[PDB]
């Protein structure tokens, strides 16, 4: 119960979302290169 309130704090939510944003980019530069088509 209260563990979700601690999970809903600003630092925990911030680190969780920043982990998502950073991991997506680590996987992006590891998988396909940007195709980019004129």
């Amino acid at each position: 119960m209260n563990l979700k309130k601690y999970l809903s704090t600003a630092p925990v939510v911030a680190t969780l979302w920043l982990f998502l944003t950073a991991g997506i980019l680590i996987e992006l530069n590891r998988f396909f290169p940007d195709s980019l088509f004129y």
Binding site: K4, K5, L7, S8, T9, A10, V13, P33, L36, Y38
Partner: protein, 153 residues
């Protein structure tokens, strides 16, 4: 300034960079598994040069580009690497703004900035089509503000 597939002064940099990497490459035995990955790394190096050659690039080997809006180079500025920043950043910004609209009500304002129910963060996905709807709501923001600002006296 000529493109690098015709610029003889760019391919020489590819040869020179691989030459500097080759001395580090040959000191170790290629048959070892911990250094078999260097050939895959130089494969990444090789697979990187061919795409940039298509973009106009400096004769010196320093590959330049275009931001004037020229349709032949919209890929380096205008369309992809630019518009997505605007959308993605503002998809976050207007989502934050919608959260700012729901930042009042009875439950304490400090509680609704920091200790927010996770459901609002899950609703963030609402903004698929920000543009004009966000323009309406920002009009209403300036409107309902009714020029209520600080003194500056």
């Amino acid at each position: 300034l000529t493109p690098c597939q015709q610029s003889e002064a760019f391919h020489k940099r590819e040869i020179n960079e691989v030459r500097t990497l080759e001395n580090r490459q040959a000191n170790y035995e290629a048959n070892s598994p911990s250094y078999l990955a260097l050939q895959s790394q130089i494969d990444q190096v090789h697979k990187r040069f061919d795409k940039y050659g298509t973009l106009l690039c400096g004769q010196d080997g320093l590959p330049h580009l275009i931001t004037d809006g020229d349709w032949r180079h919209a890929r380096e500025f205008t369309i992809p690497a630019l518009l997505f920043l605007y959308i993605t950043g503002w998809i976050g910004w207007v989502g934050r703004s919608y959260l700012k609209y729901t930042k009042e009500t009875k439950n304490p304002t400090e509680q609704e900035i920091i200790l927010d129910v996770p459901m609002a963060l899950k609703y963030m996905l609402s903004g698929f089509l920000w543009p004009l709807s966000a323009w309406q709501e920002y009009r209403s923001g300036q409107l309902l503000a009714k020029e209520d600002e600080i003194t500056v006296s």
